[PDB]
Design an enzyme around this catalytic site. Structure first.
Site, PDB file in Angstrom:
ATOM      1  N   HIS A  62      68.289  67.740  56.851  1.00 30.07           N
ATOM      2  CA  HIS A  62      67.795  68.940  56.526  1.00 30.07           C
ATOM      3  C   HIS A  62      68.353  69.714  55.138  1.00 30.07           C
ATOM      4  CE1 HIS A  62      65.762  68.972  60.340  1.00 30.07           C
ATOM      5  NE2 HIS A  62      66.804  68.939  60.935  1.00 30.07           N
ATOM      6  N   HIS A  92      76.008  75.362  52.767  1.00 27.41           N
ATOM      7  CA  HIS A  92      74.965  74.378  52.479  1.00 27.41           C
ATOM      8  C   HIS A  92      73.933  75.106  51.475  1.00 27.41           C
ATOM      9  CE1 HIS A  92      73.232  76.990  55.775  1.00 27.41           C
ATOM     10  NE2 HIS A  92      72.156  76.932  54.964  1.00 27.41           N
ATOM     11  N   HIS A  94      69.881  75.568  50.044  1.00 24.81           N
ATOM     12  CA  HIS A  94      68.164  75.412  50.079  1.00 24.81           C
ATOM     13  C   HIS A  94      67.749  75.265  48.519  1.00 24.81           C
ATOM     14  CE1 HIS A  94      68.105  76.352  54.435  1.00 24.81           C
ATOM     15  NE2 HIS A  94      69.374  77.334  53.961  1.00 24.81           N
ATOM     16  N   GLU A 104      65.523  80.907  49.498  1.00 23.77           N
ATOM     17  CA  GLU A 104      64.747  81.584  50.779  1.00 23.77           C
ATOM     18  C   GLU A 104      64.344  83.097  50.777  1.00 23.77           C
ATOM     19  OE1 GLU A 104      67.178  79.777  54.179  1.00 23.77           O
ATOM     20  OE2 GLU A 104      65.371  78.423  54.380  1.00 23.77           O
ATOM     21  N   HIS A 117      74.223  79.241  51.103  1.00 18.71           N
ATOM     22  CA  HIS A 117      74.519  79.760  52.466  1.00 18.71           C
ATOM     23  C   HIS A 117      76.078  79.486  52.716  1.00 18.71           C
ATOM     24  CE1 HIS A 117      70.135  80.412  53.375  1.00 18.71           C
ATOM     25  NE2 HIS A 117      70.613  81.288  52.425  1.00 18.71           N
ATOM     26  N   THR A 196      67.813  80.748  59.501  1.00 17.90           N
ATOM     27  CA  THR A 196      66.397  80.417  58.866  1.00 17.90           C
ATOM     28  C   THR A 196      66.001  78.931  59.071  1.00 17.90           C
ATOM     29  OG1 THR A 196      67.456  79.215  56.790  1.00 17.90           O
ATOM     30  CG2 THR A 196      67.198  81.759  56.605  1.00 17.90           C
ATOM     31  N   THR A 197      66.590  78.331  60.032  1.00 17.41           N
ATOM     32  CA  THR A 197      66.443  76.888  60.661  1.00 17.41           C
ATOM     33  C   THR A 197      66.349  77.196  62.108  1.00 17.41           C
ATOM     34  OG1 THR A 197      68.511  76.421  60.493  1.00 17.41           O
ATOM     35  CG2 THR A 197      67.108  75.592  58.594  1.00 17.41           C
TER      36      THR A 197
HETATM   37  O1  LIG Z   1      70.581  76.284  58.244  1.00 22.62           O
HETATM   38  B1  LIG Z   1      70.526  77.614  58.212  1.00 22.62           B
HETATM   39  O2  LIG Z   1      69.210  78.423  58.566  1.00 22.62           O
HETATM   40  O3  LIG Z   1      70.038  78.012  57.058  1.00 22.62           O
HETATM   41  C1  LIG Z   1      70.731  79.433  56.761  1.00 22.62           C
HETATM   42  C2  LIG Z   1      71.952  79.664  57.398  1.00 22.62           C
HETATM   43  C3  LIG Z   1      72.253  79.092  58.865  1.00 22.62           C
HETATM   44  C4  LIG Z   1      73.410  79.550  59.431  1.00 22.62           C
HETATM   45  C5  LIG Z   1      73.749  78.911  60.738  1.00 22.62           C
HETATM   46  C6  LIG Z   1      73.323  77.403  61.136  1.00 22.62           C
HETATM   47  C7  LIG Z   1      72.079  77.110  60.295  1.00 22.62           C
HETATM   48  C8  LIG Z   1      71.608  77.852  59.157  1.00 22.62           C
HETATM   49 ZN   LIG Z   2      70.737  78.152  55.149  1.00 21.61          ZN
END
Ligand SMILES: [O][B]1([O])O[C][C]C2=[C][C]=[C][C]=C21
Ligand SMILES: [Zn+2]
EC number: 4.2.1.1
Length: 258
Positions: A62, A92, A94, A104, A117, A196-197
């Site tokens: 992802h 990470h 996006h 995002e 993030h 957001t995932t």
């Molecule tokens: O991947 B994620 O949605 O992107 C936003 C940040 C976050 C925070 C904790 C786990 C996953 C994600």
């Molecule tokens: Zn993220």
């Protein structure tokens, strides 16, 4: 038929397996800069990353995650809207297929080329898995990327991506300093939201910096060479791994700045 960012499994489908996708505090959101209210009661954020211990970089299918040692209070976020201490676990990004999309969060409907993030969990809950079950479990520092000048502090990340092209690959990634990814100003917006995932848990205090960082076209092109697929599988470039803006509902975005 797992979730992802394709036509058949992308964000508009996630609610079937994760009904909270239609919840009351989903992320990301559009930040309307005229409606966000200055909140004189917030604090300056405290980003304490001098003792950060990076360990590894992982292509999870992802995104890629740069993982830290969070077994003690080494790299922590405090202050701003937060009560108590949040430990850095990973960062990470996006990003888009082209520079006009990828973020995002949006700012007055503007999309940035990418969004970083930095994920932190509340130490009062003892571990990440317990933290994500709490409304104040996580604090995510969000930083927009625009394309222009190179970001020197990003190049060590760019240069390891060839080694983690496909889903499930990892590489050693010690001694990386996340201070090299911050903009000059820590001015921010904040609001209560979600991952957001999937599983889209409503556990995040979002802190979105106003000032973007600049990265080069060559740097973001290397992000776009990653693969969503596993080794040997048909190549699906890892691009457009962003969820669009969700309804704000009964939430106020607060600004740290006038
Ligand atoms: O991947 B994620 O949605 O992107 C936003 C940040 C976050 C925070 C904790 C786990 C996953 C994600
Ligand atoms: Zn993220």
């Amino acid at each position: 038929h797992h979730w992802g960012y394709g036509k058949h499994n992308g964000p508009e489908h996630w609610h079937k397996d994760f009904p909270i996708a239609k919840g009351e505090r989903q992320s990301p959101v559009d930040i309307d800069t005229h409606t966000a209210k200055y909140d004189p009661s917030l604090k300056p954020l405290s980003v304490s990353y001098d003792q950060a211990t990076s360990l590894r970089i992982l292509n999870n299918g992802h995104a890629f995650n740069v993982e830290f040692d969070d077994s003690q209070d080494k790299a922590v976020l405090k202050g701003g809207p937060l009560d108590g201490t949040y430990r850095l676990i990973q960062f990470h990004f996006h990003w888009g297929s082209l520079d006009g999309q990828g973020s995002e969060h949006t700012v007055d409907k503007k999309k940035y080329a990418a969004e970083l993030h930095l994920v932190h969990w509340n130490t009062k809950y003892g571990d990440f898995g317990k933290a994500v079950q709490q409304p104040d479990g996580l604090a995510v520092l969000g930083i927009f990327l625009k394309v222009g000048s190179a970001k020197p502090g990003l190049q060590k990340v760019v240069d390891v991506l060839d080694s983690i092209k496909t889903k499930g690959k990892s590489a050693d990634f010690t001694n990386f300093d996340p201070r090299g990814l911050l903009p000059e100003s820590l001015d921010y917006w904040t609001y209560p939201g979600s991952l957001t995932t999937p599983p889209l848990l409503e556990c995040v205090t979002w802190i979105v910096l106003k000032e973007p960082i600049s990265v080069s076209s060559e740097q973001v092109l290397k992000f776009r060479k990653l693969n969503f697929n596993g080794e040997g599988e048909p190549e699906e470039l890892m691009v457009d791994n962003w969820r669009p803006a969700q309804p704000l509902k009964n939430r106020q975005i607060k600004a740290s700045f006038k």
